[PDB]
Amino acid sequence: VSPPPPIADEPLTVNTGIYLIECYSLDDKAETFKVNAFLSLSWKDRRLAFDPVRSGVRVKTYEPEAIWIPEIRFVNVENARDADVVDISVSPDGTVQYLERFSARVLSPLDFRRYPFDSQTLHIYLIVRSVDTRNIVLAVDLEKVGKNDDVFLTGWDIESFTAVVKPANFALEDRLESKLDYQLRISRQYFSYIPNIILPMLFILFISWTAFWSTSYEANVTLVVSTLIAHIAFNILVETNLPKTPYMTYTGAIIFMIYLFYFVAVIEVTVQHYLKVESQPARAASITRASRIAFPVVFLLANIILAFLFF
Amino acid sequence: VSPPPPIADEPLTVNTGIYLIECYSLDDKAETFKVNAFLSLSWKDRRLAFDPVRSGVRVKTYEPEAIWIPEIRFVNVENARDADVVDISVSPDGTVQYLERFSARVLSPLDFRRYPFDSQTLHIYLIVRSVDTRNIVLAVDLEKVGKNDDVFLTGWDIESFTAVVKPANFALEDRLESKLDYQLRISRQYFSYIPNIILPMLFILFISWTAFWSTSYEANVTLVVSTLIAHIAFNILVETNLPKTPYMTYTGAIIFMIYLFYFVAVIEVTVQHYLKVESQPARAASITRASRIAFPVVFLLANIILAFLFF
Amino acid sequence: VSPPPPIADEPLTVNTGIYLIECYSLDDKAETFKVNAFLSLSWKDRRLAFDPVRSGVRVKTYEPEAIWIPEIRFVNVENARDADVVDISVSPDGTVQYLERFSARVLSPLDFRRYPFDSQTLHIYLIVRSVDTRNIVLAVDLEKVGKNDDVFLTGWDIESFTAVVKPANFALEDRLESKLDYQLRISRQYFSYIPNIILPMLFILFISWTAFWSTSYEANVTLVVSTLIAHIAFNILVETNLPKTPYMTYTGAIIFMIYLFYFVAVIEVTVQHYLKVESQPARAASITRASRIAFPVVFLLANIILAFLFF
Amino acid sequence: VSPPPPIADEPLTVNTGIYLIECYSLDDKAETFKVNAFLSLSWKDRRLAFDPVRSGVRVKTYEPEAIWIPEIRFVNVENARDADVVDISVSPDGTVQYLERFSARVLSPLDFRRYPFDSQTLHIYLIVRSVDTRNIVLAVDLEKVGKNDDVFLTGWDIESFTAVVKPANFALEDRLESKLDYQLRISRQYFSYIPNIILPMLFILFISWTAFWSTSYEANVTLVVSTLIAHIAFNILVETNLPKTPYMTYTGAIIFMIYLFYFVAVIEVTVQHYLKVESQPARAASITRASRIAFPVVFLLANIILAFLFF
Amino acid sequence: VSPPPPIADEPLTVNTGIYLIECYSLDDKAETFKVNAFLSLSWKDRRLAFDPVRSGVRVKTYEPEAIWIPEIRFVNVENARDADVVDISVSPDGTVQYLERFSARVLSPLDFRRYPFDSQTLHIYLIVRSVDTRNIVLAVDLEKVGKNDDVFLTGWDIESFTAVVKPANFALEDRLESKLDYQLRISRQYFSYIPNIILPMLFILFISWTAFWSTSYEANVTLVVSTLIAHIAFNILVETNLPKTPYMTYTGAIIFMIYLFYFVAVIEVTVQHYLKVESQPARAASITRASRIAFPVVFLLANIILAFLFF
Ligand SMILES: [Cl-]
Ligand SMILES: [Cl-]
Ligand SMILES: [Cl-]
Ligand SMILES: [Cl-]
Ligand SMILES: [Cl-]
Ligand code: NA
Ligand code: NA
Ligand code: NA
Ligand code: NA
């Protein structure tokens, strides 16, 4: 078994199609996702042509090892791909129709800058190395590129599954490569993040600000230190769900900024008490009275600025 | 080996039956469950017929590769479903009786809206792609569809295992597909949720309300902030056992609402102290006196409204 | 290859023997355990009989695929059995001696009612489906059922490994089935639970009771709320090591009851302070004096009652 | 393929050699470790004797299935027969030189009594069951038993890799078994345990003892209760890294003992306050003055005793 | 199939080349990383030579088992290397061009001394054991050693992928071995460590130092003990991301040192109160006044010293 010869010097066009059956396990930390799909290949092998009449059939079936199959590989698969062939059909002129059912753990990077409001473009790269006799080029048969209606990704909205029709042509180890880009467009379902992380995080911060309506140092220290600890718990919880990025994520920025607010509240609480002990509650009163407006205003403005910078 | 010819233009009916041997590992976060079962296939292959009077043997045994077997696949499976063929029996008439023992990690979505009081309908979809020569259609032999009595799914009650008898016949990639729906009806054993999460969560909330019977700001801040922290621990613990949903779960709603109660208890505690310092304990006394009745009443009513909206 | 014919209409007796090599990974949450053992099968195949004299040898070695081997399957195994044939020997008269080395992740339910003082009966069910020519029945050769002396289970005491000699006989999907029951009797090593969970849990509760020798509301609130939080930590830690049961476990009951003791100490602490503020320390003194004896006595009685109900 | 004939009643000697390439993943909880090594087997098969002149080669090479290979099995593994034959060399006399690369998850119990100062003796047991025709006995070729210099075990010091030269010959299920014991001697690198667990644990305990220089009940309750909670965190963290033992580990004993110190510190703090309220600060003063010396002294002695009992 | 004979007594040179397709899962605790790459082998087999003109084809293709392939094996790999042969090409002169696509979990130790500012040199060791007929030696074809532009390692910067050109030739078990060192140079992206661990850790420490501007013992005990607990949380969080080293890591040193600062702050807070009670607030005032300057200064000095010692 060896590649089909070119009539002229033409390259061999393998028509591809990925049809998603299942989407699952989008792992944020690992930047991987698992897929269950149909891979369809179609090419011209003249050596396998036949006359419909003298055969008694309009189409012929084959076993994988009986005929030449192009070595289509996945560029970005974590766990060594396992594939079982479902059908091989040969039409009169020698057109092969390959159909396999595969499943792989695809590794595609994610952009966490707008987390948890972010949207992602997942990739599946098909590749084919050209052989000694002739060159192999990939093409997309848009007719066999889809995803079923049932397909759901847990915690994500599946927008589209398209393929970049023009393959990327290049050389690797003095050999011609044909690479294709299948793109899964998804957007994160941020709903749950609101009552589970964002709102509890805001509540504990507002609770900390009640120290602005209290003259009790011992109570203020308990209010501010306690809420700060609860904020550390939320910070830790958030950072366990995410990988370590070389940039600031939106949630990350908000969380980091809230530390500054706790820190300044501590300073204020400290200052107010210090002045009170030094017998000048009048200066302490005015700093506390300002704080009651200042913190909410500055917090709100800081957030407006951040949202602007990030969106 | 190739499909049996139709006498007429008729499609081939493959009779299916799934008999559950074991149910295990219902993972809520992943929305998967593992199964260990018997798959039985039965169809008409005229090429394998024989006379019963002359043959001597009433039933003929075969090895898988010796005869044509229809490619029955599972739609919603994760881990490759290993299959061990246990027996192949041919009727003298030509009827085939296939029996395999399989095991798979099945991926079926779950509805967490009523958690931990929810009930689920797990699916196992069988599929068969039609071949070149003739079309294949699936059917249910209710006689070979069951589950053994021993079958238990840890933390769940197994209600029923039925199959939707009418297959979903549709065209995919210019070929006809026959899909069958086996349904496992299960309901969650909520018992453990009561003394482990629900009651401790209520106790800490009631402990927080004792601040309505004390004039000590320092003690009230310790009561309300501490219990609030313990409530965050329960919230975190609960949300780790569940996937991120684009909707509110029942437990989620209760938990979120309790934050509002803590927040308002802080405001009250703050107000009471502020008035006390301002030398008007009379207004503070009446706000506190109201709070005792108000809090339990409103909490109770709120719960009734929520349980109503959810059930 | 097909089953040996009955001289008469008699069923075929397959003699089974399991010798445990290793026991490991008893997973409480999953209710599974892993095993490494020898499986021995022995049956009469008349077709391979011989005369010890003319054949030249009294023993005859064989390869698996060369002769008919009965399809002995494991019922309750999660991880798809992988079997290595170590030896196949044929006696002159035609008796076969099969010996395989297997390893499986066995799924067997556990009774957590007396946890961590519980004892368990783990099961390994061998099964054999009868074929169309003749019926197959299982039997135990007590001579080949054991476990080596080195066999240990981490955190458990291995009491006995016996097999129920009389096999179950039943019909499944119109064919006869022979199931056996191998039983591994184990008891939990509760030792570590005493200084790691039980004693720290008791200490924090006794620490909570020192509030009965204090008139300081602010100190009492700190004592009772703090220890209650530490009790939540122990509760959470315990419930992570166990699956969600539809019943109350012993540890579970004790833990749940201790919440009531915290709750009532809060009420007491609240009452004492309230009376003190209302200028009646005499009533408060007598309530606190009573609590000093009541709390320990009631706790002790409650425990005796529980231990009685559970053991 | 069948075993070599005994030229006389003599058993067959298979010479073994394990050469460690990699050591990794010593899992304390599971009591397992993973290994990557060379297994070398060498025995005499006279049936494979040849003439270097006639066959035109000084050494013959073979494929595994072409010749008889003794079934050498690993006793204490979970690994499930992973490997690759690197070479098979047969010299003219019939000496076979088998060399395979293997990797396994060996399961060997650990002694946690002196943790984290403990040393362990890991085992790899090779076994061979004797066949029908003749008996097989194992032997160690000390020349082929080693470990490369690069071999490192994360968090452990590798002392020696020797093999017990005399095999353990015994009877199992009516056949002769030859067992070999390869021993990996390792000692735990306790360094990290000092600044991560031991010193922070001592610091929080000493912090608790400052309550012996304070007359403030509210401050003492905060000191002792808080540090006790931090001690629970360390206890939990430690017990997650260890399996549940039926004995007391060194760390376990220290940790358990520190609970008694917290408990008695609470009693003291309680007593001191009670006396103060009762208007006898003189008795309280003498109890607190004693406590300062008492606690350090007793703690120190208790530790001298434990280190003595354990080492 | 056997090794090609030397014209002279010369050793056989196998030219190697590793071309990284993907880098993923650098596990700090396990000291492993996963790789997806091309392995290219090239050697001279005179037995496969032929005429370019008379033969008619310039290059001839072969299947793996048809020709002799040198047994090139990876030293430091965990999961069995999965090899998919992509192409085998023979030059007319008899040179072979092997190209496989492999993926492995590589075990390479890491230096945590400068964590999280550390840089690592990952290794991939290729090895070849010489055979009985002739010796095999490895060499690097720098032309086929690279990594694609897309290659990214999450949380790391990929510096370079070079190979040490001179093989390490040594004797192991009487046969000669040729080992090659491919080196992946990477540096850790420390960015995220700054707002997630380092800055929150500094903030809580500065918050603890406000006790130097307070005379309230009860508030100081709450400030210092609370922040100390938050520091333990950060310590625990950090040590879960790292393996147990026999040395001090940079972060480890900083973290350990901060415990000393908390401890001395406790002593100060204790001293100040003790003096206040003893009616000497003048000595207490001067100790706190000194502490206000000493703590920040000594902290700043100590850090400079540490960074010096570590960088
Ligand atoms: Cl392919
Ligand atoms: Cl099938
Ligand atoms: Cl079997
Ligand atoms: Cl072997
Ligand atoms: Cl190779
Ligand atoms: Na082919
Ligand atoms: Na407090
Ligand atoms: Na063999
Ligand atoms: Na070969």
Curated annotation (Swiss-Prot), chains A, B, C, D, E:
Locations listed in the record: Cell inner membrane
Alphabetized Pfam families for the sequence: Neur_chan_LBD (PF02931)
Predominant cellular place of this UniProt entry's protein: membrane
Chain ranges on the Periplasmic side, renumbered to this chain: 1-189, 241-248
Keyword line: Cell inner membrane, Cell membrane, Ion channel, Ion transport, Ligand-gated ion channel, Membrane, Potassium, Potassium channel, Potassium transport, Receptor, Signal, Sodium, Sodium channel, Sodium transport, Transmembrane, Transmembrane helix, Transport
Reported impact of E218 to Q/D: Decreases binding affinity of TBA
Chain ranges passing through the membrane: 190-212, 216-240, 249-277, 281-311
Regulation of protein activity: Tetraethylammonium (TEA) and tetrabutylammonium (TBA) inhibit the proton-activated currents in a dose- and voltage-dependent manner in vitro, whereas the blocker of acid sensing ion channels, amiloride, has no effect. Channel current of GLIC can be inhibited by inhaled and intravenous general anesthetics at and below concentrations used clinically. Ion conduction is also inhibited by lidocaine and by divalent transition metal ions such as cadmium ions.
Gene Ontology molecular function, alphabetical: extracellular ligand-gated monoatomic ion channel activity; identical protein binding; potassium channel activity; sodium channel activity; transmembrane signaling receptor activity
Effect of I198Y: Marked gain of function, with a ten-fold shift of the proton dose-response curve towards lower concentrations
GO cellular component terms, A-Z: plasma membrane
Domain of life: Bacteria
Membrane topology, Cytoplasmic segments: 213-215, 278-280
Membrane topology: Multi-pass membrane protein
Similarity comment: Belongs to the ligand-gated ion channel (TC 1.A.9) family.
Entry's free-text remark on domains: Consists of an N-terminal ligand-binding domain that encloses a wide aqueous vestibule and a transmembrane domain that forms a narrow channel.
Primary role: Cationic channel with similar permeabilities for Na(+) and K(+), that is activated by an increase of the proton concentration on the extracellular side. Displays no permeability for chloride ions. Shows slow kinetics of activation, no desensitization and a single channel conductance of 8 pS. Might contribute to adaptation to external pH change.
Additional observations: The homologous nature of GLIC to eukaryotic nicotinic acetylcholine receptors and other eukaryotic pentameric ligand-gated ion channels, and its sensitivity to general anesthetics, define GLIC as a structural and functional model of signal transduction in the nervous system, also relevant for exploring the molecular basis of anesthetic action.
Assembly and interaction partners: Homopentamer.
Protein name (record): Proton-gated ion channel
Provenance organism: Gloeobacter violaceus (strain ATCC 29082 / PCC 7421)
Taxonomic placement: Bacteria, Bacillati, Cyanobacteriota, Cyanophyceae, Gloeobacterales
Encoding gene (name): glvI
